[PDB]
């Protein structure tokens, strides 16, 4: 019936008692939640209900809900930043709405009007705007979440769903607020995602399967998993981050390389932004290309590697110092090379996020 | 550690729901009066198990089951016998598989015997829901979810184990073989080497819905899951795949894909392999089967039967595969189907207590 919900229909139930804000320098990522959340119910029978902004509450779900049985679920991750000018900005949020819509279609969750969801998210951040931290090293994490709630054990396209948005204040990625280079666990026994799978979507099913390898990484003194793919051991992603390699390539050219979007790579907003910046600067070759462990070890032997880093909303730029592979520790000289490019990218993205320079990539809160 | 069945806290419902007509049941849509719930935390371990009225779950919206598919499930049945004794069927294999799935999911381990006793006590309390029909059964859905209120992608420090009961009818309303048409599109891959395809983890299923919709759009009832450059035939929807044929060496053979990481080790699959091995009437091979193997065999009139196996269907004969724009006929229904019928008769006779078997347990 109701094709899609509208921000103009928002029903706002303000909280009576507002919670004390956390210290932005003693925050664990995604553990502290703001006063309010967005919820929107859908059914096949009646379509989208009116959207609600209401106090953070537990969800009341039928125990047969397909999100709990068949991972009929997806999420997004984007941030609000309090600028040096005290204006709150979103960063490329229409890219998150596009990616969420694409994920919903592949999940068989009901489609929604992307502009109306973004306006609902803006109104939620506006209401909880004092949760956007007063710190140029902290931000407000925005977690749109979309779950199948049909009370049927049939493996089927859902006839009931809930779209909701949580807000979580977060500090710097590492407590130190400076580059803490990560050690990676590279075990080809595990595969994050495969050709013909859903690795290019933020569907919950891609993450539950990763926890065992992450635990093995921590057991072996590593902070993140290096996700290897195929007989040639392609390096694909670092934990929940896109993978960048800054090196002299096989042709002796200075190059920033990242795996191509061939179906096993999550198309990161950060990844997109870094490729755009590197293209704009025009100071070295920019290549979306396959990179193997043998490519990397051959390059290290030839002193051709400068930097390796992950990219993502949570870290921005996460330098890599070491990879544990085939029972050996392989040193990556990222931190002995500045890291010049990683630092330059972090400085440029944070200058844009916190309004130190104007950009088409930011929207001031409505 | 573990919860213990001896600690069960039973809160009976004071209002009972009307039992459904056993001949008008939609699979997994009707739920019984009671459920099992058991809370876990890293801090305190397993809480006492509860049998209480079916209720909504109250979950923190940050629960890792909702964000990162930190979840697994099982599927097994209780059957009201011809002698009116309620029986479970190979339930220890479900407990083994659930335990193994929990380890792969990084959910907390539990005592398999304690969970089975808790399930028996739940079915016993709701035993009148086990249908009065030799074509209907009580579906048992153990479910295990991460309830950590954290957006970190991490091993959960909070979890809920629960069990739902759902009365269900025959797989097809007719209660006779309705052979399935399969949609074979290699662009979709159910599972990969180094993934979780050999575990009943929720994450393996959410990704499948789009392909299932495409199957139904093209007049097919199930997806044929193809893998690799050679187009291995792996599974049929949520069922293991059996091929009864004359193999390349001219030998009568029952073939099924091997457990190399992309196959869910079905209880029904296990039972069928056990029966075929016991009978000793033909070769039994856990081997790769490709679309080219199958079409070469069909061209040589070497195929007898193809069927899916699973708790829901038992034996699901396959009549056709839509592949590369061609409808490929499988002569299953023109060959009896003799083996499919024999397997269905044997397993249903055991389930409904028409013959004694080590595979069944009479309810606690
Ligand atoms: C072996 N371990 C892994 O490979 C691993 C994987 C993911 N990780 C994250 N992490 C999320 O938890 C969530 C997250 C998204 F996408 F939700 F924002 N991004 C992420 O980087 C973090 C993290 C996140 C935020 C702040 C500090 N640390 N650390 C890891 C480690
Ligand atoms: C393109 N479509 C597919 O490939 C497809 C997939 C799974 N399917 C099931 N089905 C579950 O829905 C659930 C289920 C488990 F495992 F939970 F018991 N088994 C299952 O066979 C059913 C079904 C189940 C019970 C009764 C009648 N029909 N039909 C399909 C079709
Ligand atoms: C979210 C995510 C990324 C990073 O995407 P951003 O939009 O830059 O936050 C990378 N890899 C995986 C697997 C992800 O889920
Ligand atoms: C559950 C399941 C089966 C069948 O298992 P049974 O124990 O026989 O019910 C087959 N394949 C997949 C993918 C499954 O999830
Ligand atoms: Mg519109
Ligand atoms: Mg041929």
XYZ file of C-alpha atoms in Angstrom, chain A:
366
model
C 0.000 0.000 0.000
C 2.300 2.845 1.322
C 5.158 2.503 -1.225
C 7.750 4.330 0.987
C 7.841 6.343 4.271
C 8.289 10.177 4.306
C 10.300 12.376 6.755
C 7.296 14.816 6.749
C 5.314 12.004 8.560
C 7.946 11.662 11.389
C 6.312 11.029 14.813
C 8.756 12.363 17.479
C 8.499 10.982 21.063
C 11.256 12.842 22.999
C 12.970 11.091 25.972
C 11.993 12.437 29.464
C 15.443 11.864 31.072
C 18.516 12.634 28.903
C 21.646 10.469 29.601
C 25.067 11.869 30.667
C 27.446 12.146 27.652
C 30.619 9.989 27.748
C 34.231 11.333 27.952
C 35.313 11.179 24.248
C 38.816 9.874 25.327
C 37.408 6.843 27.307
C 34.913 5.568 24.623
C 34.917 1.932 23.318
C 33.650 1.955 19.662
C 29.904 1.176 19.312
C 29.180 0.499 23.052
C 27.598 3.885 24.050
C 24.251 4.878 22.430
C 22.506 8.312 22.343
C 19.037 9.162 23.778
C 16.962 8.536 20.587
C 16.648 6.054 17.692
C 14.734 5.977 14.371
C 12.331 3.037 13.708
C 10.174 2.367 10.601
C 7.951 -0.758 10.338
C 7.143 -2.401 6.961
C 4.630 -5.149 6.028
C 3.741 -6.593 2.567
C 0.032 -6.025 3.508
C 0.180 -2.260 4.417
C 3.670 -1.168 3.169
C 5.743 1.358 5.190
C 4.313 2.716 8.473
C 5.128 6.327 9.483
C 8.720 6.735 10.770
C 9.306 7.277 14.542
C 12.082 9.103 16.440
C 11.707 7.778 20.008
C 13.851 6.917 23.059
C 16.474 4.174 22.568
C 14.662 0.929 23.547
C 15.021 -2.848 23.149
C 13.343 -4.260 20.014
C 10.343 -6.582 20.630
C 10.859 -9.314 17.966
C 8.960 -12.565 17.279
C 11.542 -15.314 18.029
C 10.855 -16.693 14.480
C 12.089 -13.348 12.952
C 14.094 -14.251 9.782
C 16.922 -11.838 10.892
C 17.627 -14.362 13.759
C 17.390 -17.607 11.638
C 18.536 -16.754 8.060
C 20.503 -13.475 8.607
C 17.865 -11.480 6.612
C 19.666 -8.250 7.595
C 22.016 -5.495 6.418
C 23.620 -2.372 7.921
C 25.402 0.866 7.035
C 28.137 2.909 8.750
C 28.619 6.687 8.338
C 29.570 9.598 10.629
C 28.554 13.082 11.759
C 31.549 15.399 12.525
C 31.462 18.621 14.600
C 33.547 21.103 12.552
C 36.228 23.557 13.800
C 33.419 26.126 12.988
C 31.003 24.117 15.273
C 28.853 23.147 12.215
C 27.884 19.409 12.196
C 28.602 17.751 8.806
C 27.699 14.428 7.193
C 30.308 12.948 4.798
C 29.148 11.524 1.390
C 25.905 10.225 3.074
C 24.078 9.755 -0.297
C 26.732 7.052 -1.158
C 25.683 5.155 2.046
C 21.963 5.508 1.060
C 22.777 4.158 -2.474
C 24.807 1.216 -1.035
C 22.073 0.431 1.573
C 19.368 0.463 -1.190
C 21.511 -1.877 -3.409
C 22.091 -4.196 -0.353
C 18.297 -4.203 0.409
C 17.498 -5.324 -3.204
C 20.093 -8.160 -2.979
C 18.755 -9.133 0.530
C 15.080 -9.070 -0.796
C 14.296 -6.486 1.950
C 11.707 -3.865 0.907
C 12.979 -0.811 -1.051
C 12.655 2.680 0.487
C 13.066 6.292 -0.717
C 16.820 7.058 -0.148
C 16.205 10.859 0.171
C 13.456 10.268 2.822
C 15.719 7.931 4.894
C 18.568 10.520 4.738
C 16.159 13.298 5.931
C 14.955 11.001 8.801
C 18.648 10.362 9.754
C 19.362 14.154 9.630
C 16.349 14.816 11.977
C 17.594 12.067 14.389
C 21.179 13.529 14.463
C 19.652 17.068 14.849
C 17.609 15.950 17.925
C 20.700 14.194 19.450
C 23.172 16.820 18.053
C 24.811 17.452 21.506
C 26.056 13.778 21.250
C 28.254 14.836 18.257
C 31.490 15.216 20.276
C 33.292 18.562 20.900
C 36.642 17.077 19.751
C 38.426 17.028 16.344
C 39.461 13.364 17.122
C 35.889 12.112 17.965
C 32.647 11.738 15.918
C 29.062 10.368 15.990
C 28.777 6.903 14.364
C 25.449 6.395 12.499
C 24.235 2.758 12.195
C 21.266 2.310 9.840
C 20.132 -1.336 10.275
C 17.496 -3.274 8.298
C 16.110 -6.630 9.537
C 13.564 -9.251 8.418
C 10.953 -9.631 11.216
C 8.548 -12.123 9.571
C 7.410 -14.718 12.152
C 7.849 -17.675 9.734
C 10.596 -20.368 9.635
C 10.209 -20.569 5.807
C 13.424 -19.529 3.941
C 11.621 -16.762 1.990
C 11.549 -13.066 1.015
C 10.262 -11.384 4.226
C 6.651 -10.016 4.481
C 7.616 -7.974 7.620
C 10.719 -5.816 8.263
C 12.110 -3.095 10.579
C 14.473 -0.315 9.436
C 16.130 1.424 12.429
C 19.021 3.851 13.049
C 21.280 3.927 16.140
C 23.750 6.713 17.027
C 26.991 5.929 18.937
C 29.616 8.555 19.936
C 33.128 7.214 19.163
C 36.657 8.449 19.923
C 39.844 7.944 17.857
C 40.225 4.384 16.373
C 43.164 3.665 18.783
C 43.091 5.112 22.385
C 46.493 6.872 21.693
C 44.813 8.966 18.898
C 48.006 8.455 16.762
C 48.887 5.678 14.219
C 49.073 2.295 16.039
C 50.236 0.089 13.128
C 48.406 -3.314 13.008
C 49.819 -6.870 12.739
C 47.773 -9.011 10.270
C 47.041 -12.781 10.447
C 47.161 -14.220 6.861
C 45.762 -17.798 6.803
C 44.500 -18.898 3.337
C 42.333 -21.598 5.066
C 39.625 -18.867 5.543
C 37.811 -16.895 2.788
C 35.793 -13.742 3.677
C 33.826 -13.679 0.388
C 33.736 -15.455 -3.004
C 32.744 -14.697 -6.629
C 28.937 -15.240 -6.804
C 28.549 -14.347 -3.085
C 27.481 -11.158 -1.222
C 30.955 -9.823 -0.177
C 30.262 -6.541 -2.074
C 27.223 -5.849 0.231
C 27.084 -4.916 3.961
C 24.829 -7.952 4.666
C 25.209 -9.343 8.230
C 25.960 -12.854 6.857
C 29.426 -11.648 5.625
C 30.514 -10.803 9.250
C 29.258 -13.726 11.435
C 31.470 -16.112 9.373
C 34.605 -13.916 10.015
C 34.646 -14.171 13.873
C 36.481 -17.554 14.016
C 39.425 -16.256 11.893
C 39.501 -13.007 13.994
C 39.789 -15.098 17.224
C 42.624 -17.135 15.565
C 44.352 -13.803 14.635
C 44.176 -12.571 18.305
C 45.362 -16.055 19.556
C 48.500 -15.530 17.338
C 49.141 -11.930 18.599
C 47.623 -10.130 15.514
C 45.032 -7.255 15.659
C 43.315 -7.855 12.256
C 42.812 -10.612 9.624
C 44.369 -10.254 6.158
C 41.657 -11.841 3.940
C 43.330 -14.037 1.252
C 41.458 -15.336 -1.854
C 42.155 -17.942 -4.561
C 45.042 -20.300 -5.459
C 47.419 -17.256 -5.918
C 46.578 -15.812 -2.412
C 45.174 -12.414 -3.512
C 45.279 -9.895 -0.617
C 41.689 -8.514 -0.614
C 40.744 -6.690 2.632
C 42.139 -5.955 6.145
C 39.499 -6.942 8.765
C 36.471 -4.732 7.844
C 38.644 -2.295 5.764
C 39.685 -1.920 2.106
C 43.414 -2.632 1.428
C 45.866 -0.088 -0.105
C 49.491 -0.812 -1.119
C 51.872 2.111 -1.894
C 54.921 0.676 -3.700
C 57.165 0.606 -6.781
C 55.279 -1.783 -9.147
C 56.825 -4.479 -11.458
C 57.387 -1.777 -14.180
C 59.420 0.378 -11.691
C 56.562 2.975 -11.388
C 55.549 4.557 -8.028
C 51.943 3.260 -7.609
C 49.012 3.269 -5.145
C 47.239 -0.096 -5.714
C 43.953 -1.505 -4.329
C 42.019 -4.665 -5.322
C 39.339 -4.151 -8.015
C 35.542 -4.306 -7.366
C 35.131 -7.798 -8.935
C 32.500 -9.007 -6.387
C 34.644 -9.999 -3.318
C 35.471 -6.374 -2.231
C 33.105 -4.094 -0.226
C 32.991 -0.821 -2.253
C 34.130 1.469 0.618
C 33.221 5.188 0.624
C 36.746 5.779 2.105
C 38.278 3.612 -0.702
C 36.382 5.696 -3.345
C 37.530 9.003 -1.709
C 41.216 7.850 -1.549
C 41.198 6.812 -5.262
C 39.603 10.225 -6.130
C 42.300 12.140 -4.110
C 45.189 10.052 -5.567
C 43.803 10.669 -9.130
C 43.445 14.441 -8.354
C 47.062 14.724 -7.020
C 48.506 12.939 -10.114
C 51.884 12.369 -8.319
C 51.930 8.552 -8.907
C 50.076 5.760 -10.797
C 46.674 4.731 -9.285
C 45.731 1.088 -10.074
C 42.686 -1.041 -9.194
C 44.526 -4.352 -9.677
C 45.035 -7.806 -8.115
C 47.813 -7.999 -5.477
C 49.106 -11.411 -4.243
C 51.230 -12.423 -1.215
C 53.983 -13.373 -3.775
C 53.687 -9.864 -5.377
C 54.162 -8.376 -1.851
C 57.086 -10.624 -0.668
C 58.887 -10.169 -4.065
C 58.443 -6.358 -3.655
C 59.698 -6.425 0.011
C 62.817 -8.442 -1.107
C 63.453 -5.631 -3.697
C 62.839 -2.781 -1.135
C 59.892 -1.686 -3.406
C 57.178 -1.404 -0.638
C 56.614 2.055 0.971
C 53.267 1.744 2.847
C 50.287 -0.581 3.409
C 47.064 0.636 5.093
C 43.386 -0.245 5.542
C 40.613 2.297 4.811
C 37.128 2.532 6.322
C 34.686 4.844 8.127
C 35.898 3.591 11.581
C 39.695 4.063 11.093
C 39.934 6.391 7.998
C 43.582 5.188 7.404
C 44.967 2.185 9.425
C 48.699 1.549 8.753
C 49.932 -2.095 8.602
C 53.409 -2.972 10.079
C 53.510 -6.828 9.869
C 51.851 -9.932 8.322
C 52.087 -13.449 9.858
C 52.077 -15.911 6.894
C 53.247 -19.575 6.515
C 54.717 -19.464 10.077
C 56.901 -16.345 9.344
C 56.498 -12.657 10.437
C 56.823 -10.377 7.336
C 57.695 -6.732 8.239
C 55.978 -3.972 6.167
C 58.046 -0.745 6.374
C 54.954 1.580 6.457
C 56.006 3.423 9.667
C 59.684 3.785 8.465
C 58.376 5.584 5.301
C 56.594 8.365 7.307
C 54.052 7.043 6.705
C 53.959 9.981 4.212
C 50.973 8.983 1.973
C 48.860 7.544 4.873
C 49.461 10.796 6.882
C 48.635 12.988 3.827
C 45.355 11.050 3.178
C 44.363 11.184 6.904
C 45.107 14.962 7.052
C 43.086 15.630 3.816
C 40.033 13.501 4.831
C 39.973 14.904 8.437
C 40.344 18.519 7.093
C 37.225 17.850 4.894
C 35.275 15.985 7.668
C 35.859 18.759 10.299
C 35.227 21.664 7.839
C 38.861 22.983 7.788
C 38.265 23.234 3.984
C 35.073 23.415 1.831
C 34.133 20.223 -0.118
C 31.253 18.774 -2.243
C 31.758 15.642 -0.019
C 30.162 17.204 3.132
C 26.565 18.336 3.952
C 25.896 20.687 6.944
C 23.116 19.220 9.210
C 19.560 20.336 8.150
